[PDB]
Structures are given as C-alpha cells and as structure tokens.
Amino acid sequence: MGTQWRGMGLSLMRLDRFRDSILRSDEAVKPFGLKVSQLLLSTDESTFDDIVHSFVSLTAIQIGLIDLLSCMGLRPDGIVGHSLGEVACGYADGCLSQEEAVLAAYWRGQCIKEAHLPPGAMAAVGLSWEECKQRCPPGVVPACHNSKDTVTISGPQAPVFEFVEQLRKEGVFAKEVRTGGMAFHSYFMEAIAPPLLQELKKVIREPKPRSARWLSTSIPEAQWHSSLARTSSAEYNVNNLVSPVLFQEALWHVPEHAVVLEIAPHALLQAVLKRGLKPSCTIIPLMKKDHRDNLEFFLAGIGRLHLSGIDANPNALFPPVEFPAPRGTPLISPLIKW
Numbered sequence: 316m317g318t319q320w321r322g323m324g325l326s327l328m329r330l331d332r333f334r335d336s337i338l339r340s341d342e343a344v345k346p347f348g349l350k351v352s353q354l355l356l357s358t359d360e361s362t363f364d365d366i367v368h369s370f371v372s373l374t375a376i377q378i379g380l381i382d383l384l385s386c387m388g389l390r391p392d393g394i395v396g397h398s399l400g401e402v403a404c405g406y407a408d409g410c411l412s413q414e415e416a417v418l419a420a421y422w423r424g425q426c427i428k429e430a431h432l433p434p435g436a437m438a439a440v441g442l443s444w445e446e447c448k449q450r451c452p453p454g455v456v457p458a459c460h461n462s463k464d465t466v467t468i469s470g471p472q473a474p475v476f477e478f479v480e481q482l483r484k485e486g487v488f489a490k491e492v493r494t495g496g497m498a499f500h501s502y503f504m505e506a507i508a509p510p511l512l513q514e515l516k517k518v519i520r521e522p523k524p525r526s527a528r529w530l531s532t533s534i535p536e537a538q539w540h541s542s543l544a545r546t547s548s549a550e551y552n553v554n555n556l557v558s559p560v561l562f563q564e565a566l567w568h569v570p571e572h573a574v575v576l577e578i579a580p581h582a583l584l585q586a587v588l589k590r591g592l593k594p595s596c597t598i599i600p601l602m603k604k605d606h607r608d609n610l611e612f613f614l615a616g617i618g619r620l621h622l623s624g625i626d627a628n629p630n631a632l633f634p635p636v637e638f639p640a641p642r643g644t645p646l647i648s649p650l651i652k653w
Contacts, residue, residue, distance in 0.1 A: 435498025
C-alpha cells in the first residue's frame with residue numbers, strides 16, 4: 316500500500332494482455348458492485364481516497380503486470396511481498412487463482428472499512444527495528460523493518476505526531492507515510508481479524524502449498540517450516556494483515572547477481588531495495604508515478620532485463636505479425652557484423 320496514483324495503469328491498458336487481465340479481474344469483482352476499469356479511468360480525486368478502491372486497483376495492476384511478464388516466458392526464481400501484495404505473490408507462485416487474489420484484496424478492503432476503528436497513521440524514521448522498539452513510546456510498535464535505516468511505526472495519530480516531534484528534536488528523518496487515515500500492523504488489527512478470517516475462509520476454498528521460491532515476510536524465519544506457513548490459507552492472509560513486516564530480514568537471501576523486478580504501479584521500494592540488497596544487484600522499476608507514458612517505461616524495463624542476461628522476447632506482448640513477411644522487408648544478412 317502507498318503506491319497508488321491518479322490514472323495509474325491507463326497507458327498499459329492499451330496492450331491486449333493487460334486489458335484482458337483487467338477485464339477478468341473486473342468480472343471477478345462484478346458481483347460486489349465496483350468495476351476496476353472505471354476506477355482506473357475515472358478522474359475524481361475521491362476515487363483513490365477510498366481504501367477498497369486502492370486495494371483492488373493495486374492488486375489488479377500487479378496481476379496484469381505478472382501476466383505481461385509471464386507472456387514472455389519469464390518465471391521467477393524467488394518472490395517477496397510487502398504488506399499487501401503477498402496476494403500478488405500468491406498469484407505469481409500459482410498458489411491463488413486470479414479471482415481468488417482479487418476477491419481477497421476486495422474483502423480485506425471491505426472489512427477494514429466496516430471496522431470503524433479509531434484514527435491511525437504510520438510514520439517511518441531512521442530508528443532501527445532492533446533499537447527502535449526500546450526507543451519507541453508506549454502504545455506504538457515497529458511497523459515494517461524495511462531496512463537498517465528505514466522503519467515504520469503504527470498507532471494513534473496523536474502519539475505518532477508527538478513522537479515525530481520528539482524525533483525531529485533529534486533531527487532524524489521522520490515522516491508520516493501515506494496511510495489514508497488508518498494505521499496497519501498494530502493492535503488495532505486485533506479486532507478486524509476474526510470476521511476477516513471467516514470471510515476469507517469463505518472465499519478461498521482449497522488451501523494450496525506455498526512453493527520454496529516464495530519467501531514469506533509475515534511469519535518469521537524461525538517458523539518458515541511451521542504449519543501455518545505451509546499453505547497460503549485465510550490464516551496466512553489474516554496473519555499478514557495483523558503482524559508486522561520483516562521485509563529487511565527477507566532480502567538477505569537474494570543470491571548475488573540476482574535481477575530484482577519491482578512489480579508495482581510506482582517503484583517506491585526501489586530506494587529501500589537499493590540499500591537493503593547486495594552491491595551487485597540490478598533493480599528495474601517497471602512504472603513511475605505521473606509518467607508521460609508508462610508503456611515506454613515498461614519497454615525500457617524489458618530492455619534493461621535484456622541487457623542483464625535474462626532472455627525475454629517482446630514480440631509476445633503485441634499482436635502477432637502474419638507471415639510470410641511483405642515483399643520489400645529490409646535485408647538482415649548485411650547487418651550481421653563479426
């Protein structure tokens with residue numbers, strides 16, 4: 316969450332695969348009364364102010380991006396999530412059908428809305444996860460161990476402001492991350508889980524195993540072999556919603572020279588991944604907020620994937636060209652140089 320923007324994904328909707336993915340996702344969300352395509356196209360700022368719309372739109376965009384990448388034959392060797400988007404990881408690993416992921420996102424957003432919990436917000440400061448907890452004021456807990464210098468704290472808005480003032484008294488880098496009036500990964504989530512768990516158990520029918528490529532980020536490393544982490548069932552999603560995020564603890568396991576792709580409408584975690592990763596990793600954004608034309612950025616991402624040794628063919632994206640080619644196609648033999 317936190318990577319949405321006005322009219323995101325409109326440029327990528329011109330491609331056939333992305334549009335088909337969006338149409339399938341909308342058909343999945345049709346019964347409940349919101350259409351993803353209209354949300355994307357609409358321009359009123361209130362469209363993304365809501366939470367359910369933001370969640371559904373982000374999940375749909377990520378699923379469409381994964382479909383575009385899969386159209387080129389790419390299959391990941393690892394997977395990582397961050398707060399929401401663990402569902403996108405589920406789709407990427409085959410552990411959840413498209414309808415399953417979209418419905419899970421929508422129901423998360425719907426349950427969070429109806430909860431009627433008090434106001435909340437998140438602020439991430441330079442304090443380290445290990446040391447922040449001791450230095451954190453009562454009633455506020457570490458939210459996301461993003462990196463050795465970035466950590467998020469969730470809780471009541473007023474305590475967040477007071478601790479932000481205290482920290483700026485120290486001069487540290489503190490900012491209330493865009494949370495939309497609600498703070499996640501805290502005790503506030505304690506009440507939401509039960510109804511959410513029952514709803515999800517209603518939604519997902521047959522829990523399926525989580526492959527070894529997926530590296531969880533809600534269940535600590537000590538229990539990756541535990542029972543809960545074995546299968547991505549409503550229990551896993553509820554735990555992801557409730558507990559904090561061990562994102563930094565998950566990036567150590569990226570083998571050197573690994574190419575990392577940021578499947579997200581906006582590459583917010585690019586800066587975090589640049590310092591949390593090894594010195595020889597390659598990071599590709601795949602999208603930028605308020606870009607002139609996102610298709611060009613995506614194509615540049617695929618080209619930069621090409622430069623890194625990963626062979627991805629861009630022909631699969633566009634409609635095929637019938638053959639034999641028209642008479643007069645430029646000769647290719649002269650171009651080959653040794």
